[PDB]
Amino acid sequence: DIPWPARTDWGGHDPATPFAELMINTHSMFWPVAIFIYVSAIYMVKK
Amino acid sequence: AAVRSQIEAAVYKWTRPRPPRLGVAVPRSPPGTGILFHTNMQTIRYSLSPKVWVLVTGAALVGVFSGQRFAQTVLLSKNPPNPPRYREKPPVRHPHTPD
Amino acid sequence: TWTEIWWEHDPTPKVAQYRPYVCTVESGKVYWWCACGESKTQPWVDGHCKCSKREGGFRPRRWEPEHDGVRLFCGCKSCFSSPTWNGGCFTKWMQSNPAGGMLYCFAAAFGFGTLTVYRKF
Amino acid sequence: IYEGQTVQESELIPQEDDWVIEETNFCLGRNCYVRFREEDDLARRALHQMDSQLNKMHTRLRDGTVIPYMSFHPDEMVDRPAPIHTFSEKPLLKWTWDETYEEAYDD
Amino acid sequence: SIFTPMDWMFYYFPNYSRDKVALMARQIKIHFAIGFALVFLVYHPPYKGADYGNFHKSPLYWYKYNQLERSGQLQENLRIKRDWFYDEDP
Amino acid sequence: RDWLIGVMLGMYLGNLCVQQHRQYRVDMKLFYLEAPEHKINWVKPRGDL
Amino acid sequence: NLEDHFDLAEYMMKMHNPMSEYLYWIAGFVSGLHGILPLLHSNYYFSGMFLPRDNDNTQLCDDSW
Amino acid sequence: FYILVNNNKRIGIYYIKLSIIIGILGIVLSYIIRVELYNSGNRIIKYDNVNYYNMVITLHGLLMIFYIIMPGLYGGIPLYILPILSVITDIVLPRINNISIIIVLISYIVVINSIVIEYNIGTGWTLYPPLSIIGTVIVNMILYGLIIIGISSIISAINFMNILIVIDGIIYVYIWSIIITSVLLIISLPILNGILLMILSDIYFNSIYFILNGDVVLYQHLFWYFGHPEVYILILPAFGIISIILSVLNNKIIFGMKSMILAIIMISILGSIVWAHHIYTVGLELDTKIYFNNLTLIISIPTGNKIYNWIILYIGSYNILYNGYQSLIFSIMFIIIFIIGGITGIIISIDIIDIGLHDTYYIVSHFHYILSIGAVISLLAGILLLKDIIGYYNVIIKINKYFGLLLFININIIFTPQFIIGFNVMPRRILEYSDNIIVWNLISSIGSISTILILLSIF
Amino acid sequence: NPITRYLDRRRAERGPYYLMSNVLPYHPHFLWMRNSHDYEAAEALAARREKDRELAAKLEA
Amino acid sequence: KSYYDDFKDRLKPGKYTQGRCPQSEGDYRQESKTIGREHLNDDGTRSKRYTVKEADALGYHYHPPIDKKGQVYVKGPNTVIERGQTWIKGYELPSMEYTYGPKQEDIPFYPRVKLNVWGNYNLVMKVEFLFFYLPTIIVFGICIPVYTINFAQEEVIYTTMTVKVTGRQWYWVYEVESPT
Amino acid sequence: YTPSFERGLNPELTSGDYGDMPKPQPLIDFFTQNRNPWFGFAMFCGFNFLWWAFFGAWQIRPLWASQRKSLAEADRLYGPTKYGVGKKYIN
Numbered sequence A: 001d002i003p004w005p006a007r008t009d010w011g012g013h014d015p016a017t018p019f020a021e022l023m024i025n026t027h028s029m030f031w032p033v034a035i036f037i038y039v040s041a042i043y044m045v046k047k
Numbered sequence B: 001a002a003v004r005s006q007i008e009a010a011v012y013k014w015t016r017p018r019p020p021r022l023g024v025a026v027p028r029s030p031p032g033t034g035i036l037f038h039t040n041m042q043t044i045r046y047s048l049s050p051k052v053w054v055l056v057t058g059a060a061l062v063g064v065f066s067g068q069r070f071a072q073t074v075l076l077s078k079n080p081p082n083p084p085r086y087r088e089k090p091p092v093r094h095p096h097t098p099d
Numbered sequence C: 001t002w003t004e005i006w007w008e009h010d011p012t013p014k015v016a017q018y019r020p021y022v023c024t025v026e027s028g029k030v031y032w033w034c035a036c037g038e039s040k041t042q043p044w045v046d047g048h049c050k051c052s053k054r055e056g057g058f059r060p061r062r063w064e065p066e067h068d069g070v071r072l073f074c075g076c077k078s079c080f081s082s083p084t085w086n087g088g089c090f091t092k093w094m095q096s097n098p099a100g101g102m103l104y105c106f107a108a109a110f111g112f113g114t115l116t117v118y119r120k121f
Numbered sequence D: 001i002y003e004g005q006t007v008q009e010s011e012l013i014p015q016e017d018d019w020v021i022e023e024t025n026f027c028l029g030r031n032c033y034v035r036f037r038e039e040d041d042l043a044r045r046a047l048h049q050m051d052s053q054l055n056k057m058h059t060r061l062r063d064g065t066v067i068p069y070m071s072f073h074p075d076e077m078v079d080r081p082a083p084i085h086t087f088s089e090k091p092l093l094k095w096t097w098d099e100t101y102e103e104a105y106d107d
Numbered sequence E: 001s002i003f004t005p006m007d008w009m010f011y012y013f014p015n016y017s018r019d020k021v022a023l024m025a026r027q028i029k030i031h032f033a034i035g036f037a038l039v040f041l042v043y044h045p046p047y048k049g050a051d052y053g054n055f056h057k058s059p060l061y062w063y064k065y066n067q068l069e070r071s072g073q074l075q076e077n078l079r080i081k082r083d084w085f086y087d088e089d090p
Numbered sequence F: 001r002d003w004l005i006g007v008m009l010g011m012y013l014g015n016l017c018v019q020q021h022r023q024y025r026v027d028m029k030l031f032y033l034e035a036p037e038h039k040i041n042w043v044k045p046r047g048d049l
Numbered sequence G: 001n002l003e004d005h006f007d008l009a010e011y012m013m014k015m016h017n018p019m020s021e022y023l024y025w026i027a028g029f030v031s032g033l034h035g036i037l038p039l040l041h042s043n044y045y046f047s048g049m050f051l052p053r054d055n056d057n058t059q060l061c062d063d064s065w
Numbered sequence H: 001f002y003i004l005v006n007n008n009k010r011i012g013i014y015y016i017k018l019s020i021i022i023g024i025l026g027i028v029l030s031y032i033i034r035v036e037l038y039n040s041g042n043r044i045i046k047y048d049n050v051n052y053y054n055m056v057i058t059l060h061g062l063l064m065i066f067y068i069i070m071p072g073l074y075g076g077i078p079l080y081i082l083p084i085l086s087v088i089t090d091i092v093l094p095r096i097n098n099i100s101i102i103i104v105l106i107s108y109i110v111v112i113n114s115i116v117i118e119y120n121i122g123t124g125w126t127l128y129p130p131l132s133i134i135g136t137v138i139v140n141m142i143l144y145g146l147i148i149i150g151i152s153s154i155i156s157a158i159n160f161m162n163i164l165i166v167i168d169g170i171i172y173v174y175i176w177s178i179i180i181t182s183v184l185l186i187i188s189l190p191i192l193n194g195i196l197l198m199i200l201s202d203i204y205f206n207s208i209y210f211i212l213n214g215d216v217v218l219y220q221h222l223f224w225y226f227g228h229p230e231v232y233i234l235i236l237p238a239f240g241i242i243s244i245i246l247s248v249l250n251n252k253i254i255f256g257m258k259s260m261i262l263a264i265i266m267i268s269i270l271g272s273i274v275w276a277h278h279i280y281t282v283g284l285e286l287d288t289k290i291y292f293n294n295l296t297l298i299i300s301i302p303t304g305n306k307i308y309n310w311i312i313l314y315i316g317s318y319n320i321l322y323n324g325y326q327s328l329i330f331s332i333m334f335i336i337i338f339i340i341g342g343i344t345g346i347i348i349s350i351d352i353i354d355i356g357l358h359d360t361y362y363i364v365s366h367f368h369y370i371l372s373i374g375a376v377i378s379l380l381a382g383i384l385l386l387k388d389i390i391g392y393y394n395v396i397i398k399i400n401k402y403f404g405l406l407l408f409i410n411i412n413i414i415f416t417p418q419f420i421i422g423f424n425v426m427p428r429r430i431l432e433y434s435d436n437i438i439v440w441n442l443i444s445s446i447g448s449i450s451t452i453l454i455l456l457s458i459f
Numbered sequence I: 001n002p003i004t005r006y007l008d009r010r011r012a013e014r015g016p017y018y019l020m021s022n023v024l025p026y027h028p029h030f031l032w033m034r035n036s037h038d039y040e041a042a043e044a045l046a047a048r049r050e051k052d053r054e055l056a057a058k059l060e061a
Numbered sequence J: 001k002s003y004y005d006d007f008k009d010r011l012k013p014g015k016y017t018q019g020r021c022p023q024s025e026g027d028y029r030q031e032s033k034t035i036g037r038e039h040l041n042d043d044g045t046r047s048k049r050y051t052v053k054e055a056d057a058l059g060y061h062y063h064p065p066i067d068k069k070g071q072v073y074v075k076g077p078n079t080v081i082e083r084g085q086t087w088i089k090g091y092e093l094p095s096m097e098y099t100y101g102p103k104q105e106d107i108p109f110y111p112r113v114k115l116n117v118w119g120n121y122n123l124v125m126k127v128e129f130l131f132f133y134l135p136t137i138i139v140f141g142i143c144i145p146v147y148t149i150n151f152a153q154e155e156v157i158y159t160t161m162t163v164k165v166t167g168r169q170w171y172w173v174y175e176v177e178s179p180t
Numbered sequence K: 001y002t003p004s005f006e007r008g009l010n011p012e013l014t015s016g017d018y019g020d021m022p023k024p025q026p027l028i029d030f031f032t033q034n035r036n037p038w039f040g041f042a043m044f045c046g047f048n049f050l051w052w053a054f055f056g057a058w059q060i061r062p063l064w065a066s067q068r069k070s071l072a073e074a075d076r077l078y079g080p081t082k083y084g085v086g087k088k089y090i091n
């Protein structure tokens, strides 16, 4: 509904429509893949 | 301690590395050739042999997921049932409604 | 395992210790590190080991700190960042005692798993 | 992919039992900012800069041949700082092949 | 060749790969035809793909379905857990 | 071979967010069904000021 | 000539007049002023003040200062 | 002489010098923005002078893109080393090279003069009509600057393409990076000129393209048909630099040189056909949206190959070599930072995610991490690598671990919170905002003042 | 924001949940507003609450 | 040891800010009168006359260097005949202490080592395949989700009410059907 | 701070005459940097930033105490009803 202080709200917050829920879950679905892509690559940044 | 040394000696014997199957076309060292280089050469990283690497890496994987289970079953708690949803009176007026 | 199974023409050190040596060092001073593991003034060359006598391909490893402080030094004599320590002493120990290595790795992974799961959950 | 030059075992056989790998230092030396003399004028400071070029340095081996300062790209081959006119004589990229012609030889 | 290490193509099919220039052209053409076909044979076809009574049920679907059917879990899972909005206040 | 450690570390850290997402969906399914936070016949129009 | 071998020889040989550096920094400083001076001028033109007082476009407490 | 010089290396220095000068104006504008956004209220801009903020954000974007990063990465480093990498005496077109830098300066003077003399209003750096065509004369002046800049960009692109005719050595990856950017410019600029001329026609010639029965969405197609190729014209030279630095400093031959080259070519072709991911919320047809979303996600493949090829360049390098040099640190930092920016780009590429995140500060943080952090650091790293060849001094940068650490920490303090407020949500191109978004905005503002202070320590 | 309040309760019940909004100020003027009040709003708000109580009793009937 | 103390003597601290006296005390802007220095200023910098006002590239002081026979002066090598062979002794650069200052002693040892190359062609080819096709798999894993969510937004729904929203500078107009 | 002489796992390899060269020390010295007060201040500094980075400074809390007690009272008296552990949080 309205922004609240010091909230991460990663991927969205307070959906009030089925489409709004879809948007939040699409981001949540891809987020672990993004973490994998980052962690897997960064771990090899070294001599 | 006797069993500890037994399993330690059993693992050790099995893990001792065998000569690598070179995937590169290198010559055979001449016979009777000893150490020719020195320790001031650029350091070459010390790498575990495949069997040892699998063993320790597998112990690490078994460790992290058993740790995840320990946290889930002991440290964390399950949600109790949501409180009953009873009918409640809403506020009579919106605070911003003109009088 | 480069010296052990791959290449037989580089000098092979002896492990003095499977743990780093902690020493206080001063900027502007040059230190000489034992690369054979037989010096009695570890982690430094004592003037009587292989490194001091230039025997069998062993030579002292020159090192100089940028700033004063306490620095960790390699005892296993095979760390990639030798003379400084980067954890290769533990790695080389696991090669020599693979059963012990698994125990420590499981314990470390167990702690890491519990903490990360407890906080995120 | 490149994996170094190929070696035949015959080429790894020493002519003496005491042969080891030559321990020649390939650190060129201790350097810092090029330090000009106050007395030197613009012309003589130019000569000073030209005499401090690392890419003109080399290491002499036991047989008298020298391994020069080398780089992957020609950017490190010009004088530092870069002069107005750099490659007056065209730099030569040497390619190798097995072709030969009789005129080059004599019996 | 699709999802194929071309080192393998060079080894196992030496005669088909002899002309590497021609081999490259086929690589482009094959994948061009695949992309073109996807649009006009998987996406475009009109009034198709709406047979929802024919949802594929794989061997794994039935393994898990029968397991739950044998026990009461399948019945319990399908049961409607709540069909009222307000609980009764005592 | 080391790069595999990174794959496994990135698969563990990713799975943590999968579990959070999994629990999130369970919670969402219970909001409109049981959560007392969900209220109906509650919001009244404010009207023009 | 040896003096002409290097581009910008005086600067590279560390003999250049410092005024050249000062002009470069001054030019950058003037460039920066093109974002600040019109801000002050425009504020005064439409308000009468060169810069606002934080939250002076909102309701303030009696003791606010 | 100074202005008459045709030396390609001197002109390269001029490009870097001018980028820093114009950059001062760019950074100042950024400080104004962040100061204003520190809390809710008016802080340094009056409510009656809100048009100035709109102009500040517009000029910030335009100057940093076309007058700072592009002249620095495509004009500065390229004009200095490309003829050397090509083992050629000098650039193919000497006189054209001279006029290009003069043109850039003249267009900069026009822009800043328009700040001083014209009424200050803004329409974004994307100059969307009808807003751009109902504005005052400052918009006309900005259009003249862009067209003039376009002339310099195209002639410089022609100059680099001619190196293929004279190159006496091997086309290294970096040379390939510049050539492909030149191709991208030759194909994208003529379209930009056309749409800009149409903006002028509506502003100055009573044309009616951007009034009812004329589709305003037309502009966005032609603009972004240049817009997105521009973001790769700005990043590809940076990639070329990263390749040289990693190979040289690690003493390791580039791995997969041909894959690096073919990855750059691929990014260009794909980047020329994905522009409408900037137009997801306009209301395009379902199939168009799916095409563009699909092709946009494909760009990650070639971009990913380059990243992993860089990683193996740093892996295995000798430990004895000192790794604290600023150039090496910046090159490594680029890989770490670019992955963040690219991954967030893939997130916004999903159109349904984009509905929530369009015109929010998440987009800001996305392109800042790539440009304000990645591109800047790449240009710094490239100049630092060529310090001996260029010959500049009177700065403490070459070995300064404090500068690198402070820059990395504080730059992340600015833009990481901007990802959070993207799901809060705080729109872009605004100055006032709700009181519940102050915390994150305040943190980013503290980051901006700190970064500026660190820029003074280099001297 | 009913779903933020529900999800906070669910998370807190399961494990350790920490909110910055709970511990830190949300505005920077807090350093000066320790004793600040709007007395005109206080009187108006109290009056509206009194009227609301009368309306509630009437609605109860 | 402190290497700075070795060349401390060469570095005499300076007297003037920026290394020049006030122009009044000495006019460094004028051309030097010293013979053979007509192209230099008093402080040693090149004079504007030499570089700008009378630059040779503009046709001033025309003096073709090449002679009648198409030759220019060239300095020969240091030739040393020996052992029935003519040898050339190359010019070795001066000690880096002379040019840089530090005494060339106690230099750390950096041995010769040939380039650090990645080996095992078969293994490398597989990695490169993965460097390309692991991202390709991930993209393919997103493709199906992307299609579905796009189809969901563009779904023909049985809407029963319409609200028209017009955006004007700077307010939002709303048109709604009124109850009959 | 006159550190101690740690012999190590193999005491015979530390039994020689060090002379001017430094002697090995316990690992607590490395963590404390020989109990350097500035490194302790720097360590405390590292914690202070990291706490700001993740959870906020928490140094403003003593100043915010009165204004966090007013916010809590308002949420309880007039805010939307909180249930269970939710009542712990105030926004």
Ligand SMILES: CCCCCCCCCCCCCCCCCC(=O)OC[C@H](COP(=O)([O-])OCC(O)COP(=O)([O-])OC[C@@H](COC(=O)CCCCCCCCCCCCCCCCC)OC(=O)CCCCCCCCCCCCCCCCC)OC(=O)CCCCCCCCCCCCCCCCC
Pocket: G008, G009, G010, G011, G016, G017, G019, G020, G021, G022, G023, G024, G025, G026, G027, G028, G029, G030, H002, H013, H016, H017, H020, H021, H023, H024, H383, H390, H392, H393, H394, H395, H397, H455, H458, H459
């Ligand atoms: C992003 C920032 C941070 C970056 C950090 C990272 C940096 C990393 C490193 C980057 C390195 C890049 C590569 C560097 C290569 C350098 C090569 C080089 O040195 O070339 C030699 C080149 C020239 O040396 P040369 O060969 O000896 O040249 C001899 C001359 O050709 C002949 O000598 P001459 O004496 O005969 O010269 C003629 C001279 C004759 O000069 C004089 O007679 C001067 C007399 C004194 C005047 C002083 C100014 C007075 C101002 C008064 C203002 C009054 C305001 C009143 C307000 C009242 C209000 C009520 O000048 C003129 O006649 C024309 C001057 C025109 C230019 C200056 C324009 C100033 C601004 C004008 C604004 C106008 C606005 C109008 C608006 C109108 C609106 C209606 O050097 C320079 O030009 C200086 C470069 C210095 C910096 C080099 C880089 C150092 C490293 C970076 C440091 C950080 C910089 C940060 C940016 C600046 C921040 C502010």
Ligand code: HEA
Pocket: A037, A041, H126, H231, H232, H234, H235, H277, H278, H296, H297, H299, H300, H301, H303, H304, H305, H307, H338, H339, H341, H342, H343, H345, H346, H348, H349, H350, H354, H357, H358, H359, H363, H367, H370, H371, J134, J135, J136, J138, J139
């Ligand atoms: C140089 C600058 C630059 C670069 C490189 C990019 C790169 C990318 N950008 Fe761009 N972008 C901008 C600058 C840039 N962008 C700017 C300035 C805007 C806003 C303009 C405005 O609106 O005014 C913008 C806007 C923008 C939007 C608009 C969002 C909106 O308007 O709401 C989108 C969405 O499609 C997008 C997507 C992408 C993608 C998908 C990439 C890809 O190139 C990213 C590719 C990189 C990776 C994917 C990471 C590396 C690869 C791997 C680690 C392999 C493994 C990863 C996977 C398998 C996914 N960008």
Ligand code: HEA
Pocket: H016, H019, H020, H023, H026, H027, H030, H031, H033, H034, H057, H058, H060, H061, H062, H064, H065, H068, H069, H072, H124, H125, H126, H364, H368, H371, H372, H373, H375, H376, H379, H380, H411, H414, H428, H429, H430, H431, H448, H451, H452
């Ligand atoms: C590459 C271009 C570039 C660069 C460097 C930056 C740098 C910065 N930008 Fe950026 N910014 C844009 C391009 C850029 N920006 C664009 C295109 C927009 C959108 C415009 C629009 O909305 O219309 C934008 C918008 C934008 C906004 C949004 C305002 C709004 O529309 O509401 C904000 C503030 O939040 C901001 C802040 C900053 C900050 C704080 C920095 C930096 O100050 C951060 C700190 C980094 C430095 C200070 C180093 C920079 C140094 C150089 C650039 C010189 C390099 C030269 C050499 C190396 C020779 N930018």
Ligand SMILES: [O-][O-]
Pocket: H227, H228, H231
């Ligand atoms: O723009 O990506």
Ligand SMILES: [Cu+2]
Pocket: H227, H228, H231, H274, H275, H277, H278
């Ligand atoms: Cu784009």
Ligand SMILES: [K+]
Pocket: H036, H037, H038, H039, H040, H041, H042, H043, H431, H432, H433
């Ligand atoms: K504000």
Ligand SMILES: [Zn+2]
Pocket: C034, C035, C036, C037, C038, C039, C045, C049, C050, C051, C052, C058
């Ligand atoms: Zn020894």
Ligand SMILES: [Zn+2]
Pocket: C074, C075, C076, C077, C078, C079, C085, C087, C088, C089, C090
């Ligand atoms: Zn060790």
